[PDB]
Design an enzyme around this catalytic site. Structure first.
Site, PDB file in Angstrom:
ATOM      1  N   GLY A   9      46.860 -70.367   1.895  1.00 46.44           N
ATOM      2  CA  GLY A   9      47.167 -69.003   2.217  1.00 46.44           C
ATOM      3  C   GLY A   9      45.917 -68.176   2.205  1.00 46.44           C
ATOM      4  CG  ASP A  10      46.495 -64.063   0.943  1.00 49.21           C
ATOM      5  OD1 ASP A  10      47.337 -64.832   0.429  1.00 49.21           O
ATOM      6  OD2 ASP A  10      46.445 -62.842   0.746  1.00 49.21           O
ATOM      7  CD  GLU A  11      46.790 -68.126  -4.302  1.00 49.51           C
ATOM      8  OE1 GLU A  11      46.262 -67.974  -5.430  1.00 49.51           O
ATOM      9  OE2 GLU A  11      47.651 -68.971  -4.013  1.00 49.51           O
TER      10      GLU A  11
END
Length: 156
Positions: free
Chosen positions: A81-83
């Site tokens: 994801g956006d991690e």
């Protein structure tokens, strides 16, 4: 095997290996070690409003910005994801030196990204864990930094 395909940063596997090695390095050297967990404020809305390729553009630009700012012996990874994670190896006052980089990261991730003749909202949140008080293993630091990210998103 050792890179995130989408962005060219490290992946979860190589992050964990390099973080474990870094712990051994700093335990001997006396350098400071910090783990910074980062996520994007408006990734979901980019995907929702402009499709999956918009969120991807956010990821690619985040990674480009992190590659500009994070130099060996420090390193950066995308988990999924956006991690994102940044591991900082540095000197001096550990809480200060980590806080200083954290501030620079937030600033650099604030500017929007061009996409398909529009601009997509960037902005990030982050949490910081310090070795050894916040964990003495890679997994302990990982987990604690993710908890710190949660706390940071709740409190601002």
């Amino acid at each position: 095997a050792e890179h995130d395909g989408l962005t060219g940063l490290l992946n979860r596997n190589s992050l964990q290996m390099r973080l474990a090695a870094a712990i051994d390095r700093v335990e001997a050297s006396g350098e400071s070690l910090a783990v910074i967990c980062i996520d994007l404020d408006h990734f979901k809305e980019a995907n929702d409003q402009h499709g999956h390729l918009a969120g991807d553009a956010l990821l690619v630009e985040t990674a480009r910005r992190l590659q500009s700012a994070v130099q060996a012996p420090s390193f950066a990874a995308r988990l999924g994801g956006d991690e994102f994670i940044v591991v900082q190896i540095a000197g001096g006052d550990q809480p200060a030196v980590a806080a200083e980089l954290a501030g620079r990261l937030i600033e650099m991730l604030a500017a929007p990204v061009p996409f398909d003749g529009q601009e997509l909202a960037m902005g990030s949140s982050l949490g910081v864990s310090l070795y050894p008080d916040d964990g003495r293993t890679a997994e302990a630091l990982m987990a604690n930094a993710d908890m710190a990210l949660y706390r940071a998103k709740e409190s601002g």
